[PDB]
Design a protein around this ligand. Structure first.
Ligand SMILES: [K+]
Ligand SMILES: [Mg+2]
Ligand SMILES: [Mg+2]
Ligand SMILES: [Mg+2]
Ligand SMILES: [Mg+2]
Ligand SMILES: [Mg+2]
Ligand SMILES: [Mg+2]
Ligand SMILES: [Mg+2]
Ligand SMILES: [Mg+2]
Ligand SMILES: [Mg+2]
Ligand SMILES: [Mg+2]
Ligand SMILES: [Mg+2]
Ligand SMILES: [Mg+2]
Ligand SMILES: [Mg+2]
Ligand SMILES: [Mg+2]
Ligand SMILES: [Mg+2]
Ligand SMILES: [Mg+2]
Ligand SMILES: [Mg+2]
Ligand SMILES: [Mg+2]
Ligand SMILES: [Mg+2]
Ligand SMILES: [Mg+2]
Ligand SMILES: [Mg+2]
Ligand SMILES: [Mg+2]
Ligand SMILES: [Mg+2]
Ligand SMILES: [Mg+2]
Ligand SMILES: [Mg+2]
Ligand SMILES: [Mg+2]
Ligand SMILES: [Mg+2]
Ligand SMILES: [Mg+2]
Ligand SMILES: [Mg+2]
Ligand SMILES: [Mg+2]
Ligand SMILES: [Mg+2]
Lengths: 60, 137, 208, 86, 74, 117
RNA sequence: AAACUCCAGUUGACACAAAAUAGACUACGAAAGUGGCUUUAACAUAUCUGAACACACAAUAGCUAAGACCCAAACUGGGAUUAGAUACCCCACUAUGCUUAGCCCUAAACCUCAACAGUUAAAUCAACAAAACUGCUCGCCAGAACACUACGAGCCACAGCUUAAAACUCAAA
């Protein structure tokens, strides 16, 4: 099951302690809602040129 | 049907049979190939010991144990004692990267047992106990 | 060697050159055509085209030779063959009709089989690893197996245990025991096999 | 210890050809890097030594992949001489 | 090497000289030793290709400058 | 795809700590490593083990172990012939990848130039 | 060899320890450091440089007090090697590595390559390394050894750290 809710920051810590004492909860994790974060638009993939001038042009 | 290298799922229904026994009921032959010794134990689906053999129990001691031929000798002996109790098909679960990793499996084949599945269960910690220090060889 | 590398070993085989041309294959015909343009070494005195020639016996005779004394070396060989045949003939006449069927009286068949029974199937090679020498079992080449059979037979005959016993008597006595899977030479093969089997866990040391 | 058994790193033997199945299992472990991980885990590799080994391998990979690319790039020139005698 | 045959024929037709082969060291700077004390060096060198077969400047380009021989190069 | 080399090495422009510390310059050479001979391994151990197993059961009598003896003897013949063929015919046959001797001739036709000409 | 045999193998239960793969990524932080997951707080400066009389930090090792016990492991003990082996190899185990609080203030703390703003043109440039330079400011350096030393001074440091000489000696380093 998924529970979506609006709570203050201090309410997150208290809820985690509550879920641990519940014997009917197999596992309970509180995370940020992924829809709140806005995915920045991606232009694409820019090719990476081969690194140059890494060594001197002296005749070894 | 095309052969699938992936083992059948115990929950699912599969048509593959080996002498009328499903994949989950096949006895298991666990192999522990250490750097110095090879221990082979054959157990059934209900975790009932059937046959056990090792290089130390088959006329090899000290450095002689850490050899492929010693593991092969143990594999033949392990098959012989398992074959007495009615074992025909085995599932191989090899643990370790020792010299007897494959030779011990050969002894089972030449001893009258059939290999249907191979599984590697080498313990790899995901970060775990800090191993011993490097040798100054 | 005074022979130039262009020289080729002569082939001493009467039936080889009497084979009809039709039976020859294309490659076999090419070999015959090629040899007409190749220099051929002179035939050694030891090898001949006689039907009585036995390569094993001549090889054994050479190994018995001391200081180039082939006349004495061959004399000991022929006396041994005569002694074996005479000993079998005495046993044949002293045996019943049923026993006479299984008695072998051919000296060559006894000699060839006796050497075969002494050939070791595996050998030992001392391998230097970890500052120590281990007798690692190895497979033996076909030439090495036959050479060991002859050398073992000769060494036992030359042993100091035998007192005032002529070589034809010692050699004939050991050949019969080898032909019957008995004697020290056969025991030598078993001892080599036992050591090789006992050190079978060291067979991984060899790198070939 | 808490996952389902006979699923991970399991190869089914086809028609009794155990040799092919074991090589397939060995190759899968090698490709995923399990084989190399186990060997380095036999004796502890200190963090200073691990970084030096990783840097060597990363530099080795760059040179190996660059040299391989040039060999494939120039492989088309491995033909016979088109101007023999000149 | 592709145009080596053409250049040699062109030089013969116009009564001039061509060197389309491997350039042995010292053909210009050490010419008095390779040929003789009275050899005459070229008064003009023309490069139809100024690069060798390893994509580097031809040795004669540097050598001709040393021997104050003008060069015309493509 | 080749891993990027931008910012990996410690340089004047690079503000961050180095990523790679190569003991040699990262410049393609004109030669490749020569082919490494395969490490020798013991052969016909299985056949030898089978042949020696019967000797223990039959008190080292060859008459009762003729079949197993021939099996090991045949294996040695195959191993010897294959080893000679692999060392001679396969090496000369140039099977698989191009030989380093021929590969180096191609590489020196297009040498790497880390300098300015 | 010693050790273990109250052991080993399969199965189940089962951390105050350590964080495969991703990572062929090259990000964050002043540096030291930082690579399992979640949440909270949070990542200085609208010109730059600037305190080795100042303040706040500083891997690892170590001290102090109370705990945690898997593994690894100074010292130590045993086994072996060796002319001897107070080492390299093997085994067992402690300090220690972890947590809390307070110390200690060192490193090849090195990317041995200062901060900011620029340039790729001339003479580019001893060598090697990781091309050569401009403007400005701060820190630092003036033969080797004595010397990461003596003395003085400061410090929760007391077998310590920081600052740091001299005489004699050499014509090299
Ligand atoms: K992890
Ligand atoms: Mg767990
Ligand atoms: Mg940064
Ligand atoms: Mg270096
Ligand atoms: Mg290589
Ligand atoms: Mg003991
Ligand atoms: Mg367990
Ligand atoms: Mg931790
Ligand atoms: Mg951590
Ligand atoms: Mg990694
Ligand atoms: Mg986190
Ligand atoms: Mg977080
Ligand atoms: Mg900031
Ligand atoms: Mg400031
Ligand atoms: Mg600290
Ligand atoms: Mg501490
Ligand atoms: Mg104290
Ligand atoms: Mg304490
Ligand atoms: Mg421990
Ligand atoms: Mg102690
Ligand atoms: Mg001691
Ligand atoms: Mg402890
Ligand atoms: Mg550091
Ligand atoms: Mg510094
Ligand atoms: Mg500054
Ligand atoms: Mg700048
Ligand atoms: Mg220069
Ligand atoms: Mg100090
Ligand atoms: Mg001091
Ligand atoms: Mg003073
Ligand atoms: Mg003082
Ligand atoms: Mg300081």
């Amino acid at each position: 099951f998924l529970v979506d809710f609006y709570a203050p920051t201090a309410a997150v810590e208290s809820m985690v302690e509550h879920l641990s004492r519940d014997i009917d909860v197999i596992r309970g994790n509180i995370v940020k809602h992924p829809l709140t974060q806005e995915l920045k638009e991606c232009e694409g993939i820019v090719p990476v040129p081969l690194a140059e001038k890494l060594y001197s042009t002296k005749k070894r | 049907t095309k052969f699938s290298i992936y083992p059948p799922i115990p929950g699912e229904e599969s048509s593959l049979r080996w002498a009328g026994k499903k994949f989950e009921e096949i006895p298991i032959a666990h192999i522990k190939a250490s750097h110095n010794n090879t221990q082979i134990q054959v157990v059934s689906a209900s975790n009932e010991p059937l046959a056990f053999a090792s290089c130390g129990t088959e006329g090899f001691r000290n450095a002689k144990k850490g050899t492929g031929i010693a593991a092969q000798t143990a594999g033949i002996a392990a098959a012989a004692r398992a074959k007495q109790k009615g074992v025909i098909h085995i599932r191989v679960v090899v643990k370790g990267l020792g010299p007897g990793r494959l030779s011990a499996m050969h002894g089972l084949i030449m001893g009258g047992l059939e290999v249907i599945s191979i599984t590697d269960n080498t313990p790899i910690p995901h970060x775990g106990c800090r191993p011993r220090k490097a040798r100054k060889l | 060697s005074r022979y130039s590398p262009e020289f080729k070993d002569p082939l001493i085989d009467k039936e080889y050159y009497r084979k009809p041309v039709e039976e020859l294959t294309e490659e076999e015909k090419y070999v015959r055509e090629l040899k007409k343009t190749q220099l051929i070494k002179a035939a050694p005195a030891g090898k001949t085209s006689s039907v009585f020639e036995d390569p094993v016996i001549s090889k054994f005779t050479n190994m018995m030779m001391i200081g180039g004394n082939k006349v004495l070396a061959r004399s000991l060989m022929i006396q041994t063959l005569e002694a074996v045949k005479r000993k079998q003939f005495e046993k044949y006449h002293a045996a019943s009709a049923e026993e006479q069927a299984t008695i072998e009286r051919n000296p060559y068949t006894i000699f060839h089989q006796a050497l075969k029974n002494c050939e070791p199937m595996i050998g030992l090679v001392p391998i230097l690893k970890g500052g120590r020498f281990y007798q690692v079992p190895v497979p033996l080449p076909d030439r090495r197996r036959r050479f060991l059979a002859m050398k073992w037979m000769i060494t036992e005959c030359r042993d100091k245990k035998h007192q005032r016993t002529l070589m034809p008597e010692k050699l004939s006595h050991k050949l019969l025991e080898a032909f019957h899977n008995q004697g020290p030479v056969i025991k030598r093969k078993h001892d080599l096999h036992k050591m090789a089997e006992a050190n079978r866990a060291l067979a991984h040391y060899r790198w070939w | 210890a808490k996952h389902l058994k006979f699923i991970a790193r399991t190869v089914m033997v086809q028609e009794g050809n155990v040799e092919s199945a074991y090589r397939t299992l060995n190759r899968i472990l090698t490709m995923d890097g399990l084989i190399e991980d186990i060997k380095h885990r036999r004796y502890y590799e200190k963090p200073c030594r691990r970084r030096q080994r990783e840097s060597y391998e990363r530099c080795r990979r760059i040179y190996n992949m660059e040299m391989a690319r040039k060999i494939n790039f120039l492989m088309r020139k491995n033909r016979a001489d088109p101007w023999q005698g000149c | 090497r592709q145009f080596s045959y053409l250049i040699e024929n062109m030089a013969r037709d116009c009564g001039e000289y061509a060197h389309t082969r491997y350039f042995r060291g010292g053909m210009l700077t050490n010419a008095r030793l390779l040929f003789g004390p009275t050899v005459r060096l070229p008064d003009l060198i023309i490069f139809l290709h100024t690069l060798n077969n390893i994509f580097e400047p031809h040795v004669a380009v540097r050598d001709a400058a040393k021997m104050n021989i003008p060069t015309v190069g493509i | 795809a080749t891993p990027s080399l931008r910012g990996r090495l410690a340089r004047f422009g690079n503000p961050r700590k180095p990523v790679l510390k190569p003991n040699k310059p990262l410049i393609l050479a004109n030669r490749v490593g020569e082919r490494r001979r395969e490490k020798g391994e013991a052969t016909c151990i299985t056949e030898m083990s089978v042949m020696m197993a019967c000797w223990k059961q039959n008190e080292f009598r060859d008459d009762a172990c003729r079949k197993e003896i021939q099996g090991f003897l045949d294996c040695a013949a195959r191993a010897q012939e294959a080893r000679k063929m692999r060392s001679i015919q396969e090496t000369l046959g140039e099977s698989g990848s191009l030989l380093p001797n021929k590969l180096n001739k191609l590489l020196q036709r297009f040498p790497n130039k880390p300098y300015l000409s």
